[PDB]
Amino acid sequence: QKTLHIYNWSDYIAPDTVANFEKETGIKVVYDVFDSNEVLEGKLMAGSTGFDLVVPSASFLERQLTAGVFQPLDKSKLPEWKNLDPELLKLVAKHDPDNKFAMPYMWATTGIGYNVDKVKAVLGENAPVDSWDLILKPENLEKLKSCGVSFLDAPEEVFATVLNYLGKDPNSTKADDYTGPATDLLLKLRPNIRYFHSSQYINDLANGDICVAIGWAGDVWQASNRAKEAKNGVNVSFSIPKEGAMAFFDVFAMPADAKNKDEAYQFLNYLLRPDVVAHISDHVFYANANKAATPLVSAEVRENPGIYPPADVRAKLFTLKVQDPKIDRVRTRAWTKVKSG
């Protein structure tokens, strides 16, 4: 009996992707999910995860490969590597040069997900839905406190967006930017935030439990969709603010101690098939990195500027940089302060 252990983000695959792969190959798949880059990193640094494949964002990949956590991908065993968009491979190459260790999977931005009707009802017809002021300006967050506000429990991501919003370098190497202005704004906003979670906000946005949230693009679109399917009247939208937003690239990589290498390569080639990934993007609402799969992606998804953004919107996006341990420590300590109260 052949097995494969995969560790991937929750709500990041089609309902049938694994079942199909199992029928076609006869390989039994054990699929586990997470919703935090930090939880994954922890397990990888701790060693012996027992996973054959894991899906970290590229910026965390760079850090983890310094620790020798992953083995390089034998590209001779992935015939359809050619399907991957070359521009996306370049961007990921900044973290994985020469693309030796990871296979780009999905990509998106971190922005604002919001209940269109509730925000208009509270902030009026002209709520600044196209800017970070909607959720990062205290006087607005105070008014929205009522209908529910949610923030991603993603330190590196929230800090970089706040830094950018304050006119600073989103990847500032100066530790006082974090403990200083960044933490001040966060502490100012903090009392208006109902919770810090990286996954339960989807159901809550979908069911009208919260009205605004800092969230990942596809997650918000999934919420929008779930609301439409339910015919509950909830109108959810997503926005990539005019001031810019962070863009991430999740990738598949193989722990250097993976036991089912053969089975893992089969799953990777399976994911390289244009039909397989386009199918995933159709259910999950995230843009995949497969150039070839584009045509096969439903037009509703493929033509959404909030999923596959145009070149001028892609121009105002930024990526996370790996920081030295001091910034790391400062940033982690500050985040615990902000969260606690």
Q: Is 219 annotated as a binding residue?
A: yes
Q: Is 153 annotated as a binding residue?
A: no
Q: Which residues of 246-261 are buried (b: 16+ CB within 10 A; e: fewer)?
A: bbbbbbbbbbeebebe
Three-state secondary-structure class, residue 167: coil
Give me the count of residues in the chain. 341
Among candidates 300, 320, 290, which has minimal Cα distance to 106?
Answer: 290
Residue with tokens 């991908």: 73
| Count of C-beta atoms within a 10 Å radius of residue 14 | 17
Written as six digits, the tokens of 235 are: 């109108």
Residues 254, 224 contacting (CB under 8 angstroms): no
Alpha helices by DSSP H, 151-307: 155-165, 175-177, 183-189, 201-206, 217-230, 261-272, 274-284, 299-302
Q: Is 131 annotated as a binding residue?
A: no
Which amino acid is residue 76, in one-letter code? Answer: S
Three-state secondary-structure class, residue 231: coil
Q: Which residues does the annotation place in the binding site for putrescine? A: 10, 219, 250
Q: Which residues does the annotation place in the binding site? A: 10, 219, 250
